[PDB]
Amino acid sequence: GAGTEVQDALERALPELQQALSALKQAGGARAVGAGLAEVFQLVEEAWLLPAVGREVAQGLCDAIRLDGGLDLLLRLLQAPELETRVQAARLLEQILVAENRDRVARIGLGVILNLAKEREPVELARSVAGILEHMFKHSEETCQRLVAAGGLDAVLYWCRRTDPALLRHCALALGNCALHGGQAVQRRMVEKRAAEWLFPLAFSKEDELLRLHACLAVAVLATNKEVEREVERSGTLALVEPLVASLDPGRFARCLVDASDTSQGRGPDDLQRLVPLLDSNRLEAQCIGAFYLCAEAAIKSLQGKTKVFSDIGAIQSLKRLVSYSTNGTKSALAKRALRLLGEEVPRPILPSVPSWKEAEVQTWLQQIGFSKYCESFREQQVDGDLLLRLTEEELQTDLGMKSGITRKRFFRELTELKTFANYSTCDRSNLADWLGSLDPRFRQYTYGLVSCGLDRSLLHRVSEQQLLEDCGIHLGVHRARILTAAREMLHSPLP
Amino acid sequence: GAGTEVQDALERALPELQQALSALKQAGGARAVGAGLAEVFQLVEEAWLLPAVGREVAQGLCDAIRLDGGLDLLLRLLQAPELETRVQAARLLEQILVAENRDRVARIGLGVILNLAKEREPVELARSVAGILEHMFKHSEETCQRLVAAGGLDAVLYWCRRTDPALLRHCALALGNCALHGGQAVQRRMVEKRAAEWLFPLAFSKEDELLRLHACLAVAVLATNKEVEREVERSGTLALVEPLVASLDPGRFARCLVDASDTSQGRGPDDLQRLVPLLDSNRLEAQCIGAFYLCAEAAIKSLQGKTKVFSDIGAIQSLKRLVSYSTNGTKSALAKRALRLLGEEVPRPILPSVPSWKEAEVQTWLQQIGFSKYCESFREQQVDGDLLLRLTEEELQTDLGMKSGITRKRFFRELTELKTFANYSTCDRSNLADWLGSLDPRFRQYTYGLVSCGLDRSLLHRVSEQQLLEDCGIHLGVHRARILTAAREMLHSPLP
Amino acid sequence: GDTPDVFISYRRSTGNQLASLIKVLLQLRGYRVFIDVDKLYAGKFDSSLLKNIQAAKHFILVLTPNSLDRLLNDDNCEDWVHKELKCAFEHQKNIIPIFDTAFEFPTKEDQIPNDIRMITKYNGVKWVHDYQDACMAKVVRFITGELN
Ligand SMILES: NC(=O)c1ccc[n+]([C@@H]2O[C@H](COP(=O)([O-])OP(=O)(O)OC[C@H]3O[C@@H](n4cnc5c(N)ncnc54)[C@H](O)[C@@H]3O)[C@@H](O)[C@H]2O)c1
């Protein structure tokens, strides 16, 4: 087993590290500590760079640095007066913020990092500090809150006005990491601090596809939050996301990675799980970039033979849903490519004219939404598009055999997405679908109930709450009341 | 069995004690009684100090002193005119207030102790009297009432303005013991007597970590009482609790204790049981210090092999709950460390974005909240985050198999904590969660019901009681009425 | 009102007890009192405490054994006790030196920095451990204002 060779690599690197660390335990002065820091920096950079699963070796070195001497002597050097020592300390620290190391500096001396966040001028320091902040924003919600309440976020937002590649790359990743981990409270602060605007120059960059791609992930994650959505639109930065995502290739990462069991790239389950709600979002931009990242990961994971993860992260049904109800090529290409890389069967995009479906379309749709257990019942009862759009809970329970109330609740959840997607040209003379959708996007699903009773924009002013309940099938009272209210207010248009 | 050697230790110490006691039965005058008191004081101090389970020997001596001559001759000497005799009596008594000895002086001559509580000036007396009062506050609710109604509490609150280490240590422990045993009535009196302020200098002390730690326990216990909470906040003393608790190490006590069956430290089940409601409290400070003390005890008890106690004190589920819904590092570290010392499996902190959970998160959460018996049903019915947040009693009973109404009541109790913890960024455009939470913290759980019906801050003014019941699922009428009332009053904001 | 009436300045090593005591005795008298809670592991730096001085009406200095040692030859103004007292003079606050029973100002008056040396000439209260409420009443007299 190759793991033995990793122990050999560790048994080489560890005594060298012990020597280099011991050569920092003495207060040797600026020259001596500069050299000692450069030695450990070299050792751990070399460890990261190993094709022979360098991540494991380097993690072992980061563990050794945590166990012996600790991050403590680094955090002391990080605030020593001589710039060289601070730079060398920051350089080293930025390369060793593994999870447990983040976990330590989150509780010891985080205030030191936020002190350095004010030293914005020296670029070698700035690069290192930005990378540190990036890593620390990946830690926890609390850590993000602390970094955003004090000057930590202000540092990366300031540094977005600089030209330096490494600094900007760290800024993009910092803002993305912050948005993905900081929870509801800090997302709101980021947008209030105009982070969406400050991501614009990084997204609009030329030289580096990954600077653009990281900046785009940040704004996509922010736009997935419904409260801040309107302001991140206002920044204009979302307009860059689809054009970029259409330009790049997901296969790139899986060929930056080498063959066999190379683990130098690839997100863990936590880091993957955070992408899935981008697929589930209503934003086209977030669905595109989420499908991009998850397709890149599908390439990496399929090469590594680690495809199991997507099935319980719940990525698979989400990608199948993107393909099914797709109205956009860029998104569809990525999602289909992802499903193929994962060796899944790929769904046909479903015909939008639901009222005209026959039995065979209903059978197809049931298979895509994962109700294939019910296909036989729907076939035997001969459900077609008109019957499907009008299924009541009673029929679903009694005639089709869907006993479980929770299962019916999931079926109606699916059916409501179909109703909302559907084309009603054969039914709706008065474009009542758009009228409903103009009140509230989630009202558009009631179109076929209204028009099937024979209502229309002219008639609607006369409808009663009981008719919306009984005839048209709008079960929620709040929805009935809003539709009904708007229908009275509309009367200035039917009167002429 | 080592217990035999304890009998040998007793068979040595007891005749020496009989001699020393007999040398106090005669009215020998100040010099003779001073010596006799010093002899018994030496004997019982030596007994406490024995590594060979000194507590058992010393309890046997305290029993012997209760049985022969009694606390009665001590209580007579305790009020003799000569200061030396009172000091020596107080010194001895302070070292022998074992449970049964407290039980005796609670019913005989407690008034003598409260008489001494006025002799505030001589430090040797004050130290001894403060220790006596500390022990007596540990006795019963009635004893606390008596000590607080008369000058007993006023003595310790006065002595908090002194400089003496031993005196202050006893004052901290007295106020803590009083808060933990005196019940609702005296807690209210302590706070009215400005006890929270007078704990400040002891919490803000420098030289002694345990003086700070005992003072912090006192204010944490007081802050757990909802009526007095606002005044103990006002004192500012709570601001000291987390910074202190973050500074110390729970392992300290278990290394002050020696190896094998050392019983010189460690709380009994009663003394432990009183800490658990600190974990269950809403106060961050009380949860921190409760987790601190209970982690220290976990170290001691695991060393002693006595881990059974935590499982039926109900500490285990409470610690698992602190880890699960944690939003604070200091608390989380202590709780995880405690669970590891007790050899329990440690829960992963749960993802706050409940609406985005898939099946695997639901299965994880069910295991943490101890509903693992239901995991199979929730898996088979494919419950995910949206379905979980919307489970009605009917579904829970019929579809998931949760037959018992009491069990459903516990499930909803759990689910309500999750709903209250959750992040609704993907759902709530209008930050209706904060609006609900600004009326009442326990209303925030209704967020997903409101927003899932499509209400929002602008619309809410139009909602009706029936819609809050039927659509949004707010079952309690009092909650409906308050939400609805506030929604009408809000109308000055939707009108513009 | 959110603002403190009084800011308490104390040397972190030796002043904490008397500072806490004065803080409590004034808080009980209904004054809103600020003390920096600076004595902990992370107690390196916080400029905002100078803004707390600027927010206060009155400034108390808890003059205590070995307290002023950090002032001596501190021409650089490195010391927090120096910075605190300097800020109080710069904003001409009501400054109240309170002396512990054992306290005396250093004989090395020239080594006390030029920007704060006048503290040695300010009127103040000699605290006595036995007479705490009487001492506190005398401090309350200073709280009426004495812009020396
Ligand atoms: N992670 C690396 O491969 C890598 C490469 C070069 C430099 N560094 C430096 O080391 C520190 C830690 O890197 P990070 O912040 O990217 O880490 P991270 O934990 O935030 O992310 C590392 C990625 O590797 C995966 N992974 C799985 N098992 C791992 C293991 N045993 N060790 C490491 N990663 C594992 C994680 O799931 C994740 O996708 C940082 O300061 C960074 O600058 C790390």
Ligand SMILES: NC(=O)c1ccc[n+]([C@@H]2O[C@H](COP(=O)([O-])OP(=O)(O)OC[C@H]3O[C@@H](n4cnc5c(N)ncnc54)[C@H](O)[C@@H]3O)[C@@H](O)[C@H]2O)c1
């Ligand atoms: N309890 C001691 O170990 C100890 C140590 C030195 C001095 N003293 C003096 O003796 C008196 C009694 O001490 P206390 O007030 O802390 O007692 P306490 O009963 O209030 O607390 C003693 C602790 O020991 C535990 N314990 C369990 N079995 C015990 C036993 N057989 N004997 C003693 N403790 C047992 C209790 O559960 C509790 O946690 C006090 O006046 C005190 O000053 C006692």
